[PDB]
Design a protein around this motif. Structure first.
Motif, PDB file in Angstrom:
ATOM      1  N   UNK A  14      11.540  23.320  25.723  1.00  0.00           N
ATOM      2  CA  UNK A  14      10.414  23.808  24.934  1.00  0.00           C
ATOM      3  C   UNK A  14      10.089  25.253  25.300  1.00  0.00           C
ATOM      4  N   UNK A  15       9.596  25.995  24.307  1.00  0.00           N
ATOM      5  CA  UNK A  15       9.400  27.436  24.454  1.00  0.00           C
ATOM      6  C   UNK A  15       8.410  27.799  25.561  1.00  0.00           C
ATOM      7  N   UNK A  16       7.228  27.189  25.571  1.00  0.00           N
ATOM      8  CA  UNK A  16       6.189  27.606  26.505  1.00  0.00           C
ATOM      9  C   UNK A  16       6.276  26.899  27.854  1.00  0.00           C
ATOM     10  N   UNK A  33      16.395  27.934  18.239  1.00  0.00           N
ATOM     11  CA  UNK A  33      16.277  27.148  17.029  1.00  0.00           C
ATOM     12  C   UNK A  33      14.997  27.502  16.291  1.00  0.00           C
ATOM     13  N   UNK A  34      13.962  27.911  17.024  1.00  0.00           N
ATOM     14  CA  UNK A  34      12.787  28.506  16.406  1.00  0.00           C
ATOM     15  C   UNK A  34      12.232  29.582  17.333  1.00  0.00           C
ATOM     16  N   UNK A  35      11.672  30.637  16.742  1.00  0.00           N
ATOM     17  CA  UNK A  35      11.337  31.854  17.475  1.00  0.00           C
ATOM     18  C   UNK A  35       9.826  32.056  17.534  1.00  0.00           C
ATOM     19  N   UNK A  36       9.311  32.275  18.744  1.00  0.00           N
ATOM     20  CA  UNK A  36       7.880  32.457  18.973  1.00  0.00           C
ATOM     21  C   UNK A  36       7.362  33.727  18.311  1.00  0.00           C
ATOM     22  N   UNK A  37       6.175  33.632  17.705  1.00  0.00           N
ATOM     23  CA  UNK A  37       5.546  34.821  17.140  1.00  0.00           C
ATOM     24  C   UNK A  37       5.264  35.893  18.184  1.00  0.00           C
ATOM     25  N   UNK A  38       4.910  35.502  19.405  1.00  0.00           N
ATOM     26  CA  UNK A  38       4.745  36.458  20.494  1.00  0.00           C
ATOM     27  C   UNK A  38       6.090  36.796  21.128  1.00  0.00           C
ATOM     28  N   UNK A  40       7.135  38.392  23.539  1.00  0.00           N
ATOM     29  CA  UNK A  40       7.234  38.336  24.994  1.00  0.00           C
ATOM     30  C   UNK A  40       7.794  37.002  25.454  1.00  0.00           C
ATOM     31  N   UNK A  41       7.356  35.919  24.816  1.00  0.00           N
ATOM     32  CA  UNK A  41       7.735  34.580  25.243  1.00  0.00           C
ATOM     33  C   UNK A  41       9.212  34.332  24.972  1.00  0.00           C
ATOM     34  N   UNK A  42       9.697  34.762  23.805  1.00  0.00           N
ATOM     35  CA  UNK A  42      11.132  34.742  23.548  1.00  0.00           C
ATOM     36  C   UNK A  42      11.896  35.618  24.529  1.00  0.00           C
ATOM     37  N   UNK A  43      11.298  36.722  24.974  1.00  0.00           N
ATOM     38  CA  UNK A  43      11.943  37.559  25.980  1.00  0.00           C
ATOM     39  C   UNK A  43      12.040  36.833  27.317  1.00  0.00           C
ATOM     40  N   UNK A  44      10.944  36.204  27.748  1.00  0.00           N
ATOM     41  CA  UNK A  44      10.978  35.382  28.954  1.00  0.00           C
ATOM     42  C   UNK A  44      12.041  34.295  28.856  1.00  0.00           C
ATOM     43  N   UNK A  45      12.075  33.585  27.728  1.00  0.00           N
ATOM     44  CA  UNK A  45      13.085  32.559  27.495  1.00  0.00           C
ATOM     45  C   UNK A  45      14.512  33.098  27.584  1.00  0.00           C
ATOM     46  N   UNK A  46      14.816  34.173  26.849  1.00  0.00           N
ATOM     47  CA  UNK A  46      16.123  34.826  26.955  1.00  0.00           C
ATOM     48  C   UNK A  46      16.483  35.215  28.384  1.00  0.00           C
ATOM     49  N   UNK A  47      15.517  35.709  29.146  1.00  0.00           N
ATOM     50  CA  UNK A  47      15.754  36.166  30.510  1.00  0.00           C
ATOM     51  C   UNK A  47      15.665  35.067  31.567  1.00  0.00           C
ATOM     52  N   UNK A  48      15.408  33.817  31.176  1.00  0.00           N
ATOM     53  CA  UNK A  48      15.812  32.702  32.030  1.00  0.00           C
ATOM     54  C   UNK A  48      17.325  32.599  32.126  1.00  0.00           C
TER      55      UNK A  48
END
Length: 59
Positions: A14-16, A33-38, A40-48
């Motif tokens: 999950x995203x958050x 599969x779905x992209x957060x409006x914020x 930053x959160x997608x950036x955090x996810x990518x950088x995991x």
DNA sequence: AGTAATCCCCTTGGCGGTTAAAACGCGGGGGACAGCGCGTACGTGCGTTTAAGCGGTGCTAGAGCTTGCTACGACCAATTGAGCGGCCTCGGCACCGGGATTCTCCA
């Protein structure tokens, strides 16, 4: 478990609850599969994945 | 300002075992229950008398209502400490075991 053994193909996350924390550096691919409006959160996810100790080029 | 993910918490559900409590069998005893005889104690009817009930007269206590106001509680803001939530510990009560005293029942 995921970091231990390469037989595991896919890690559903999950995203958050799942974007923020620890290294996942034996992945090599990140799919939103779905992209957060914020963004930053997608950036955090990518950088995991895209992280110190990352094994291969993250796509 | 809305709606959904995230995360705490607390309730319900399942699994295992262990053992203590529920179920089952069986003899016998004694208590439930039908039956009998008597006798005394309660329902009946009568004559008696007693006072409860009704129609009527008289009085005054005090229930019920209005007026007037001031003493007492409702309301608010500032002050503070009595009372609650959280943490600690040690001593009261339980729990066990073992020998001593009691009570029960057949002789």
């Amino acid at each position: 478990d995921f970091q231990t053994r390469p037989e595991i193909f896919i890690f559903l996350l999950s995203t958050r609850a799942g974007g923020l924390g620890i290294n996942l550096t034996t992945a090599d691919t990140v799919i939103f599969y779905d992209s957060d409006w914020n963004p930053t959160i997608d950036s955090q996810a990518m950088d995991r994945a895209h992280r110190l100790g990352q094994t291969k080029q993250v796509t």
